[PDB]
Symmetry: C6
Subunit: 66 residues, 6 copies
């Protein structure tokens, strides 16, 4: 309900994000795409990240909701 709208926002308004994984590392780049389970983070090369492995997504600049 919030997950997609959030993710969809970072993508549309193309804004860099610092994805912190459950393991304890911080990925970066832009949100190329996403579905129920995975998120395609397009940086140098689009790497697939599992949502179950994500701890928290952190945006650089704000983004509307509506």
């Amino acid at each position: 309900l919030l997950q997609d709208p959030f993710l969809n926002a970072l993508r549309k308004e193309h804004v860099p994000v610092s994805i912190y994984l459950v393991n304890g590392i911080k990925l970066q780049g832009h949100v190329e795409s996403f579905d129920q389970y995975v998120v395609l983070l397009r940086n140098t090369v689009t790497q697939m990240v599992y949502k179950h492995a994500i701890s928290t997504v952190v945006p650089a600049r704000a983004v509307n909701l509506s």
Copy 2:
């Protein structure tokens, strides 16, 4: 959900400052802006999406209204 939702909503409404402890030991601070079955929107300097499954404990900076 006769606890989690009421607990979170009261924090959200009253804007009670919370400390969210991640399973990986990381401590996040701020207040609850909103939430659903799967994520919580924490707001501090910015607004970050936190996955519930990665959350350990949520510690309010003060007692919550359950009545």
Copy 3:
């Protein structure tokens, strides 16, 4: 939660102190103040909501009051 509830509820009502171990090795301590399907509210110097999915084991400081059948 066929077994979960009767277990947590007994600890709550009888006000029995417990130690909650998280999947990361952390040891919480206090009283079961409340619970539902996904979370447990532990009380101590403060009050906090603990997610069940982050819990490994709940160890009571002593067996609850047992009766006949």
Copy 4:
């Protein structure tokens, strides 16, 4: 769980000591009091509640086959 129940119930009926290893490395020990879809009740000096999702391996002190 067509295996979990038979496996755990065998330990219960035979009163066989077991070692329960948590996903965090810690090992618990004692007897199997009871169990359902989500949890195992392990008895030692006291009866403690163990979530199955936090379990890696269940190891009996002896063969139950």
Copy 5:
């Protein structure tokens, strides 16, 4: 449609296997049984291994 034929091939051919857990622990033995949730590993005894705690399973040889 993959893990079952994969696991059944290990029990039907009685091939030793290595089960690595998410915590970094390695388990050796033979696949005695497996269902939708657990994997019965056989050595000195038969232990019940939850799939949710299994990261990988590499065949011995």
Copy 6:
């Protein structure tokens, strides 16, 4: 409605090597041979079964777009 099937499928056909990062940090490099809903058959010295719920990110050594 699907993102990981095509992502992994193309990485399979194009024979592109990958570096799989498990939730526990460690990394398993090799080629993707097959994959169902729950696991990914990783090829290398041997063919090992990798449970998806243990994967954090799938990082390809080469890119794949169109």
